[PDB]
Amino acid sequence: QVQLVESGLRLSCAASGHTFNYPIMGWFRQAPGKEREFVGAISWSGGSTSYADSVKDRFTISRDNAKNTVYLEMNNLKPEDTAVYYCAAKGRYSGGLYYPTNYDYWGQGTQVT
Amino acid sequence: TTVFTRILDRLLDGYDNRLRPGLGERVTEVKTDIFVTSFGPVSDHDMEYTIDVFFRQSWKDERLKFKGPMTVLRLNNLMASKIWTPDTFFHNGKKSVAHNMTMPNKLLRITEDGTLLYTMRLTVRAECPMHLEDFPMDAHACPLKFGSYAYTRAEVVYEWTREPARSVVVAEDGSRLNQYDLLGQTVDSGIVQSSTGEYVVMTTHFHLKRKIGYFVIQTYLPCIMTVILSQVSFWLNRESVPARTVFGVTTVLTMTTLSISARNSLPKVAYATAMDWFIAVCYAFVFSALIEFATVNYFTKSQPARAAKIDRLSRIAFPLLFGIFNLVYWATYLNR
Amino acid sequence: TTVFTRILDRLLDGYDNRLRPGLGERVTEVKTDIFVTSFGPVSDHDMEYTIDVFFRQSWKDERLKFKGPMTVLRLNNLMASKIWTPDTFFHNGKKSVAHNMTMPNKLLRITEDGTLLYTMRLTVRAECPMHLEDFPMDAHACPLKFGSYAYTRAEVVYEWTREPARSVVVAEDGSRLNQYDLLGQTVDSGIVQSSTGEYVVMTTHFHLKRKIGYFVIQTYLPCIMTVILSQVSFWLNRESVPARTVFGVTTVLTMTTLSISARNSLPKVAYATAMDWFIAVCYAFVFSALIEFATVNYFTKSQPARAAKIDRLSRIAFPLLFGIFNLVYWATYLNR
Amino acid sequence: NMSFVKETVDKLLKGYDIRLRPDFGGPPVCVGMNIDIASIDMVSEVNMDYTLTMYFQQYWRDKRLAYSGIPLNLTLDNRVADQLWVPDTYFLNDKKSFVHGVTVKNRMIRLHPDGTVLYGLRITTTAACMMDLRRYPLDEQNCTLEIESYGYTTDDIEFYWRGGDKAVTGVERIELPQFSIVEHRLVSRNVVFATGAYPRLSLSFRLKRNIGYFILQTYMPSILITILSWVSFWINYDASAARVALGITTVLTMTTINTHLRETLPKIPYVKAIDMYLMGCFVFVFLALLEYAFVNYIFFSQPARAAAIDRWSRIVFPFTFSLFNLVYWLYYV
Amino acid sequence: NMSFVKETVDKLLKGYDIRLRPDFGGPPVCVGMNIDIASIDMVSEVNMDYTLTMYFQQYWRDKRLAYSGIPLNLTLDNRVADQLWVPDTYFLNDKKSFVHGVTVKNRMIRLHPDGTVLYGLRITTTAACMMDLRRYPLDEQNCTLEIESYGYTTDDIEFYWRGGDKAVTGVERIELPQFSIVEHRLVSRNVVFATGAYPRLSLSFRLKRNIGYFILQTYMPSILITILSWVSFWINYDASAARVALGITTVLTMTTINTHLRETLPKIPYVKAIDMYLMGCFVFVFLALLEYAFVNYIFFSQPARAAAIDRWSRIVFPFTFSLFNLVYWLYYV
Amino acid sequence: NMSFVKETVDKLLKGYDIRLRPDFGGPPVCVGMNIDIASIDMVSEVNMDYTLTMYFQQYWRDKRLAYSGIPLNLTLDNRVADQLWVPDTYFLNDKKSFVHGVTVKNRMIRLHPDGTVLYGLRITTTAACMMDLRRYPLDEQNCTLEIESYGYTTDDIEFYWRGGDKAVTGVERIELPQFSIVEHRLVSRNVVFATGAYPRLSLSFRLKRNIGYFILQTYMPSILITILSWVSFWINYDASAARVALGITTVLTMTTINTHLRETLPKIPYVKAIDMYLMGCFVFVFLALLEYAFVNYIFFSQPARAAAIDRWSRIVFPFTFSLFNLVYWLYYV
Ligand SMILES: *[C@@H]1O[C@H](CO)[C@@H](O[C@@H]2O[C@H](CO)[C@@H](O[C@@H]3O[C@H](CO[C@H]4O[C@H](CO)[C@@H](O)[C@H](O)[C@@H]4O)[C@@H](O)[C@H](O[C@H]4O[C@H](CO)[C@@H](O)[C@H](O)[C@@H]4O)[C@@H]3O)[C@H](O)[C@H]2NC(C)=O)[C@H](O)[C@H]1NC(C)=O
Ligand SMILES: *[C@@H]1O[C@H](CO)[C@@H](O[C@@H]2O[C@H](CO)[C@@H](O[C@@H]3O[C@H](CO[C@H]4O[C@H](CO)[C@@H](O)[C@H](O)[C@@H]4O)[C@@H](O)[C@H](O[C@H]4O[C@H](CO)[C@@H](O)[C@H](O)[C@@H]4O)[C@@H]3O)[C@H](O)[C@H]2NC(C)=O)[C@H](O)[C@H]1NC(C)=O
Ligand SMILES: *[C@@H]1O[C@H](CO)[C@@H](O[C@@H]2O[C@H](CO)[C@@H](O[C@@H]3O[C@H](CO[C@H]4O[C@H](CO)[C@@H](O)[C@H](O)[C@@H]4O)[C@@H](O)[C@H](O[C@H]4O[C@H](CO)[C@@H](O)[C@H](O)[C@@H]4O)[C@@H]3O)[C@H](O)[C@H]2NC(C)=O)[C@H](O)[C@H]1NC(C)=O
Ligand SMILES: *[C@@H]1O[C@H](CO)[C@@H](O[C@@H]2O[C@H](CO)[C@@H](O[C@@H]3O[C@H](CO[C@H]4O[C@H](CO)[C@@H](O)[C@H](O)[C@@H]4O)[C@@H](O)[C@H](O[C@H]4O[C@H](CO)[C@@H](O)[C@H](O)[C@@H]4O)[C@@H]3O)[C@H](O)[C@H]2NC(C)=O)[C@H](O)[C@H]1NC(C)=O
Numbered sequence A: 001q002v003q004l005v006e007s008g009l010r011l012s013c014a015a016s017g018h019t020f021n022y023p024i025m026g027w028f029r030q031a032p033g034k035e036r037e038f039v040g041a042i043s044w045s046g047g048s049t050s051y052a053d054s055v056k057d058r059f060t061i062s063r064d065n066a067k068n069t070v071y072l073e074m075n076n077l078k079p080e081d082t083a084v085y086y087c088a089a090k091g092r093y094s095g096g097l098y099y100p101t102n103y104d105y106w107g108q109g110t111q112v113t
Numbered sequence B, C: 001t002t003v004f005t006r007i008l009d010r011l012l013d014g015y016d017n018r019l020r021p022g023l024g025e026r027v028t029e030v031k032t033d034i035f036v037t038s039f040g041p042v043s044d045h046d047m048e049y050t051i052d053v054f055f056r057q058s059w060k061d062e063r064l065k066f067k068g069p070m071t072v073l074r075l076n077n078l079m080a081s082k083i084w085t086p087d088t089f090f091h092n093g094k095k096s097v098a099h100n101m102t103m104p105n106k107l108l109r110i111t112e113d114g115t116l117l118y119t120m121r122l123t124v125r126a127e128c129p130m131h132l133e134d135f136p137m138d139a140h141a142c143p144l145k146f147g148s149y150a151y152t153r154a155e156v157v158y159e160w161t162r163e164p165a166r167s168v169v170v171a172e173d174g175s176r177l178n179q180y181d182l183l184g185q186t187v188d189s190g191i192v193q194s195s196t197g198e199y200v201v202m203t204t205h206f207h208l209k210r211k212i213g214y215f216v217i218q219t220y221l222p223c224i225m226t227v228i229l230s231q232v233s234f235w236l237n238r239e240s241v242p243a244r245t246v247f248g249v250t251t252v253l254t255m256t257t258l259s260i261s262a263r264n265s266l267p268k269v270a271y272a273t274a275m276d277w278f279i280a281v282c283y284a285f286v287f288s289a290l291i292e293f294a295t296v297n298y299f300t301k302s303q304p305a306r307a308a309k310i311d312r313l314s315r316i317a318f319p320l321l322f323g324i325f326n327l328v329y330w331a332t333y334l335n336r
Numbered sequence D, E, F: 001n002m003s004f005v006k007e008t009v010d011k012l013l014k015g016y017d018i019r020l021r022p023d024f025g026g027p028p029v030c031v032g033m034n035i036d037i038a039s040i041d042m043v044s045e046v047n048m049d050y051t052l053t054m055y056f057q058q059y060w061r062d063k064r065l066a067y068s069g070i071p072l073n074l075t076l077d078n079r080v081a082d083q084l085w086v087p088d089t090y091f092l093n094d095k096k097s098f099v100h101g102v103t104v105k106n107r108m109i110r111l112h113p114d115g116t117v118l119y120g121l122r123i124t125t126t127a128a129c130m131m132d133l134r135r136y137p138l139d140e141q142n143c144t145l146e147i148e149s150y151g152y153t154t155d156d157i158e159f160y161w162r163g164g165d166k167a168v169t170g171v172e173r174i175e176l177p178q179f180s181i182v183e184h185r186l187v188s189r190n191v192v193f194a195t196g197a198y199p200r201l202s203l204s205f206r207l208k209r210n211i212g213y214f215i216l217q218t219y220m221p222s223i224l225i226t227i228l229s230w231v232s233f234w235i236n237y238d239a240s241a242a243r244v245a246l247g248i249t250t251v252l253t254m255t256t257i258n259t260h261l262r263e264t265l266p267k268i269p270y271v272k273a274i275d276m277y278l279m280g281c282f283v284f285v286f287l288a289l290l291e292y293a294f295v296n297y298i299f300f301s302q303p304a305r306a307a308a309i310d311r312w313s314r315i316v317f318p319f320t321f322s323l324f325n326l327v328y329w330l331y332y333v
Helices: B002-012 B077-082 B213-235 B241-262 B274-298 B304-334 C002-011 C077-082 C213-235 C241-261 C274-300 C304-334 D002-012 D078-083 D212-234 D242-262 D273-298 D303-331 E002-013 E078-082 E212-234 E240-263 E273-298 E303-332 F002-012 F078-082 F212-234 F240-262 F273-297 F303-331
Strands: A002-007 A010-017 A024-030 A036-043 A060-064 A069-073 A084-090 A103-106 B028-043 B048-060 B072-075 B088-090 B106-111 B115-127 B139-148 B156-160 B168-170 B180-194 B197-210 C028-043 C048-060 C072-075 C088-090 C106-111 C115-127 C139-148 C156-160 C168-170 C180-194 C197-210 D029-039 D049-061 D074-076 D089-091 D094-099 D107-111 D116-128 D140-149 D157-161 D179-193 D196-209 E029-044 E049-061 E074-076 E089-091 E094-099 E107-111 E116-128 E140-149 E157-161 E179-193 E196-209 F029-044 F049-061 F074-076 F089-091 F094-099 F107-111 F116-128 F140-149 F157-161 F179-193 F196-209
Touching (some): B002 B072, B028 B197, B077 B106, B156 B180, B168 B180, B213 B274, B213 B304, B241 D212, B241 F273, B274 B304, C028 C197, C077 C106, C115 C139, C139 C156, C139 C180, C213 C241, C241 E240, C241 F212, C241 F240, D078 D107, D089 D094, D157 D196, D212 D273, D242 E240, E029 E140, E029 E196, E140 E179, E157 E196, E212 E273, E240 F240, E273 E303, F089 F094, F116 F140, F140 F179, F273 F303
Parallel strands (some): B028 B156, E029 E157
Antiparallel strands (some): A010 A069, C028 C048, C106 C115, C139 C197, D029 D049, D074 D107, D089 D140, E089 E140, E107 E116, E140 E196, E179 E196, F029 F049, F089 F140, F179 F196
16 A cells, blocks of 8 residues: 655655555646646656656656655646646556556645646 | 278268267266386476376277277377367476477377277476475475366266276386485375366376485585584694684584585475584584683683593593484484 | 459469479579678587578579569568478578567569569577687687588579679678677588488588687786796795795695686587696696795705705796797797 | 257357457457466566466356257367457466466366356466565565456456455465465456556465575574674684684685675665675674784783773673664564 | 448458558558567676567558448457468567467457558567677666568558657566666668668667666675785784785685676676776785785894885775775776 | 379379378388488486487388389478378487478478388487496496387387498597597387387497596696695694695685586486595595694694604605505596
């Protein structure tokens, strides 16, 4: 079991528990009228980040295993970036990286305007 | 030659090899027998063994009765693929080989009353669960279990062709063992039960005993020599402190190296073997000899008479106790 | 599309692939060429090498003439299994692989005049017998020989597509060699006679030369420095017994370690290489220096003048003999 | 009457199209699964995989194969499997699998009157299992087997464990040398790839490593060498320099033992618990060697101070080693 | 209706020539490719290769397979792939490859109404990767996969990455203990052989090796033995036996370490960084022993000079070793 | 005239029954055999087997295949072997075998006008050969190949060596690094099993191991180290450091040699000759070290006794080593 704690522009996702069984953390945002949308994903050990097109070169994702935290830095905001943000954990054999169904442990919702 | 071709064509005319003989009317009885041509190496690390056999099956199929100038047709083995055959498998097999050089190593014979003899040459790797408490003076019963995969006991049963003790025959020169000795085999049959039903199982247990000479000339003799070397220190005078210290520390290091190398060729069992107990006792003897020297050196310049008494008492006590331990250990383990 | 389907169906109508083209009338001529995409590792222990090739064959079959909108049909390699092809094999191959991922790595092209081009991608492991008397300053000619398995020279002959030097082509970046240099290759053809008849054989020799830098800085330099260090001992004064003992002991130990470790790479050939001779002579020199020191120590206290004379004589004799040995050895083994 | 059985089986396979799934174009076909674990042979930290042998049974319904007039289960020759539709089940985390084929292909086909098909295979599979070795050899691992359809999406096929938690049997009989099976778990879910959503069954085992082999194999030699180094403190010093040579030799032998130990493990890039213990022991023996070096250095002119230093090391070293052992064995257990 | 689809597929395969590519005799057929990486099992310097497992997807259009009246995409049993034309795609630098075949061959065929074929395979391939080990173990490698058409030239077939930069996924699933993935790159080009010009796709990864394991298992024993060799400097020069024993023991332990470590690697002819480090440490310990030899040589006529030499060696040897380490780690990092 | 040849060949295979042997129901068919040995690869003592590559040719007569009007011997495509009857020849003592398949299956079928069939294969086989290693490395082995008919008894078939003692060629050109082929033998006999009597051919080789490698590698270093250990007896007993260095170096080098040579062989339970030689050399050098320890122990009160003990060691050790070598080389040669 993994416990995700959301804080935070910069959003912090701190995970505790069995982070070895869920080696990938992903970011999603939900619009008021739209479904959840993938933003980016980070590997706990490999540090190999992946980003969606709409936030390439603008949003950045970093990981530190000292206290098991992942940071999403958002820069050059736009009015089309007003969505409730979530952080989630993905299993080792959970499938595609861009689909919310494949993520098991979801954090608390965080609002951004 | 045309007569036999017509006979075979009539036998196969309308034949359905998807159906066992006697389907819906009676149980199919298969008589089985094994000829071991070589009992191959045993792998302690993998807990497995290899065996090369002629596997022989025989059964009745009324659909194949014929009448002709001969009473037994010894056919090319391709005919085996045109008729029904039992689907025998080895329950504890790991990765077996059916030899195909230069042709499929199979033979099929049909008697005019419909009896079929079907023989194949196989190399079977089989699991032998071993308990190694008595290692290297351990004995094992390596099993070989086989039976039908798809047909329950209401459809196919297996029987040994002759007396069970005479249905598994080992060749007289067929031994590829280097470390073990084959003492005999026990033959039995029974019923297994699984989620798909009840099946007949035929079992053969081969009885193997490990030869000890290798571990004698590899582990026991160096340990004995190290213990004797450590006990040699008891006869040097108490002034020769660096010499006796070198003796003690070097013998302890040698004992540690021998203890470590002991399981370098062994599987990682979670319990202690007999060799482990022997090495532990030898290590204890060497360490106690070094502690004896330390105690003697402690009392050298204050109670020299006590030190001399301790030295003499050790000079007698240590070899006698080591001999008693060796006698007890070897009597315990070689008579089991 | 249907035109090509009809053409293909007419070509394969009444075509017997058991018969070579021109059977009973003339000799089938096969033009062959090789493109080496990678010259894989050479193994001295197994005496073999690995090579990856595009193997290209071309011949003429009158039965496959056609007339259509296209001049060349570049067909799916399945068609190759429905026509005759040569039965070419590699005489000194050990175990080769015809690559099958994701499909058979084969190509067939048919020209309207009845000419067939047939290409396949192969990994061949071949035997290369090595004479290691000059190791590590040796050179080898690893052969690759191929020809027909079942067709004698009266039925099938092989020719190189272009001039023999240009018929075997090695890719620029296709070297997987670690300790060898590919100097070049020679190409030839000939006849080999066996129990079943005379057969055409095509041969390609690849010339390899071992690089020496690794062994120069791994064995020869340490040995030379050890010998020089040991001969330095003759100049120390006779009072410094521990210093000369350390010199002798460490040089003998270094020579022993080098000698023990120097044979790891090679196969267990039953003769002495050049490196073995060099190490043996260096060991003899170091041991003789230690023996000289022992002799000097023995006579030191009783006949000091004799010890001084012996030291002087060795101080002159040893460098001269080592220089002469080095000159002879390197002259012999460098201009081979 | 075998002729009637033959006619019925011929009729069932008349016009049968194996290219189409049952109820093609309609609701998804439900496939139930059962596994009997025969054995779990070898678990490898070097290769990060484990080997497993099992009887794998699939259960489904094909109304094209329903028959009447024969009140029996029809066990057919396994080659009939080549003339029927079967699910395209595969294992995601496997590295090399095979079906046993002696004496014949270890395959079973059983038809039922209502059209139910039972399809059984005996499979030996090696499967990947990434391991967290930060607490090795006091570690606990979770190894899974993932079962999925390859071509058919959730609109065509559905998986389910047949019998719930009883669908996997034979786990309690498994005996492993280095491990013990604490628990096994069964999960069913869906996985989305770019080509759609697919059913997924997961079977997981939790393995706890036995410590006895490592107590006998690596911890005891280090402890015994560390204790041996303390025997020096009870030997009177001299001008011989015997004890510094002995200490150095013991430290070197410790290093040699440690290098082989690591010569027996995979090349992980982090520090393990056994590595921590071994370098603690090395620190202890190095400090003992340095202390003797100091005593031998200063004892010519200050014998009393050297004797006091030796006696205090006689007491201090066992106490600090016991404290280090207490802390180590409380932090990892 | 299952019979309607059955007759539709029978009509599709009626008159189909598998010996001919789509648009045979006309414009080249375009094939798009996708790769989903599952893992990289191992990377071997001894064999100079690496093992990769992947889902390989090919997309093309065959007008002979177009159908109407069914507004659905037909996911067919993979055996139908034996009746269709597929591209003759191969990997140039691969050495041994197989398609997984448990429980069935891991193959997928999906048809679309307009004639589009999607063809998927699950493949494990061991591909060659020549490595420059001059900076080993601080080296950085570039390993590639070359995808090509064997029989069809550029006039018959074209390759392209379907989706551009997004044609390869699953790079974050690659977990190597000894490496980390820095970057991956996709390339499309043409290659000219004597039989014509062929399309070529290339997928390359840049691997950076992790230094932690080598610090723990190789560098540390040599550093510790070199430090242990300095204990001789603090021992009085009357103890000839002890210091000689120290030097001999250190030498033999260094030789054993060197022989084992080099024995565990491929027999490359050039010198690696670790080889130069080990030879430097050997030189340092040998020079310490020769320093003692010189001191023993001169101390009987100039004892004060010998004492001064030992006193200065105590300071000089650690200083020069620190300078050597600084230069080495600056040059290689 | 390929039309007439095709007509004849199609006529031959028209009524051919591959299920029946030639002369089915009559006298046994005679099969002559020839072997051309191309190479003998690794002869392994660990696996107790050897590898052989050969051309295996079988010769027989099938009157069903006789033809007239074509004055040629017809070499056919090897796949025609799948439509003719061939003997079911197998090798009893083979563990793993294969027919080479590059570029095609290495198979030859040659028909003759009178119905004679020549059937050739190129085969590589690993065959078991149990070895007696009691005299290793001065041992002589006998390795065989057993060729038998599986299904046909002596009433259906009979084997013979075609050409008498010249039926096997290529033995004299085999090159083995570690062995030399002294002799080869051909035998023909019958073997009885419970299912009848079968013909058996035996091809045996007698292999003699070469000793030069072991003289270079094991015996000579051990002799040199044993002689080196005797140098201590000529150094005065007051020189403690020199003699201790010599003894320690000899002991550790002997141990290194032994540990290098211990597990390079299969785990046989008996003692080999090289084991006895190495254990004796170790005993000698160890006893030399013990002699020095004893001399150092009693050279203060009894210097004359120590000098006498050294002088007697100086004479006893070379003499006893010479006697041990004489006994060893007379026993094992
Ligand atoms: C590249 O080349 C390799 C060989 O070098 C191919 O591997 C062979 O592939 C063929 C074709 O698929 C296989 O032949 C088929 O085998 C089926 C049984 O396979 C099982 O059993 C064998 C042992 O008997 C195992 O080796 C195998 O792993 C399986 O467990 C048969 O059922 C097939 O029968 C077909 O032909 C007969 C002909 O009479 C018909 O009666 C049947 O109805 C049916 O049509 C067939 O014989 C062969 O077994 C494979 N060998 C090996 C060693 O794997 C690769 O497939 C090939 N790759 C590509 C992409 O072409
Ligand atoms: C080894 O490690 C693996 C992970 O790598 C562990 O596997 C996990 O096991 C847990 C159970 O212990 C799984 O959690 C369960 O998931 C089920 C599926 O959830 C999906 O589908 C549902 C709809 O059916 C969606 O709502 C959901 O979002 C998912 O898409 C759930 O159905 C289970 O529900 C159960 O628990 C909840 C409370 O948590 C209850 O309310 C329910 O009633 C029910 O009891 C459950 O949540 C988890 O999915 C597994 N992970 C993976 C990746 O498979 C192994 O357990 C572990 N091995 C060992 C021995 O510990
Ligand atoms: C591991 O090592 C391999 C080499 O062994 C690297 O592969 C090389 O990657 C580079 C890109 O980083 C390739 O260079 C590119 O080649 C493209 C194709 O060129 C061919 O085709 C064109 C016509 O289409 C011809 O004109 C040309 O002569 C070639 O035949 C070009 O299209 C690319 O050009 C692009 O970039 C340049 C600037 O660099 C721009 O000017 C252009 O406008 C355009 O945007 C480019 O030149 C190179 O070909 C690859 N080599 C091989 C052998 O494939 C791997 O990248 C490396 N891996 C890692 C991780 O570093
Ligand atoms: C490696 O080791 C194997 C044994 O494992 C040796 O093989 C033996 O070789 C010898 C010959 O060197 C064989 O002896 C010969 O057997 C022939 C067959 O005997 C069978 O058939 C006859 C009837 O024809 C029966 O009476 C008999 O019982 C057997 O059933 C004999 O025909 C030979 O006779 C020849 O020698 C005798 C004298 O001994 C003469 O009187 C005859 O005229 C004739 O010249 C002979 O007896 C023996 O059978 C082989 N053993 C096995 C098990 O096959 C290899 O030789 C050895 N390799 C090397 C290199 O030494």
